[PDB]
């Protein structure tokens, strides 16, 4: 799909990740919604599927997991579920109106009041 | 997204289910990808997302939960996942070359030689 907020590539092309298109400083907001994450080995074994863990971090994806594949890097933290999380994701780092985003980024709990004016 | 064999409805227009666009006999055969059921509590509290139950078919979706939502009746069953149930999806109700598409049906153990005659 794709939205003025940010331009997401699941469809095989040469290339999978999820780009965004609006340079800012580090603290930017993103938006999905293809990710079931949790924390417990009982997990991995229940959501077998495009498994994604990091650490603690234990979740799964089925299409956005090969978007995240493409990440030399934790580009950025994401929280899209019903339980735990959330449903935002967040940038710590600084856009470049058009550059690419993955997940799995240790934790540091903490928030900055996120502004996504309009887009 | 949408294919020959049925026309799939997951964005937001005023209209969530699965439609398909061939009419045919009580025992057709739907495709899809977004699905993670399995049978047990523990379940329940580790796909915490958007759980779609019934009886005792515990499951969750991301996209097409709401999908699934609209359906007063068990149109037909499914089956997308690695560890159990499987990747195909069964309609034992006939098809109206335009009729509707939804999930949970019992159970019913049984099968009858699938003939997808291409579309």
Redesign the interface.
């Known amino acids: 799909?794709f939205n003025d907020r940010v331009i997401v590539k699941k469809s095989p092309l040469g290339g999978y990740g999820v780009f965004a298109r609006k340079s800012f400083e580090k603290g930017e907001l993103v938006e999905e919604?293809?990710?079931?994450v949790?924390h417990?080995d009982?997990?991995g074994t229940?959501?077998?599927?495009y498994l994604f863990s990091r650490k603690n971090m234990s979740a799964?994806a089925?299409?956005f997991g090969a978007i995240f594949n493409h990440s030399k890097d934790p580009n950025a933290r994401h929280e899209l579920?019903?339980?735990?999380k959330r449903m935002r994701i967040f940038t710590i780092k600084p856009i470049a109106i058009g550059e690419e985003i993955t997940i799995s980024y240790g934790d540091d709990y903490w928030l900055s009041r996120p502004r996504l004016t309009q887009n």
């Open positions: 799909m919604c293809l990710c079931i949790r417990n009982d997990w229940a959501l077998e599927d799964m089925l299409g579920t019903a339980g735990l």
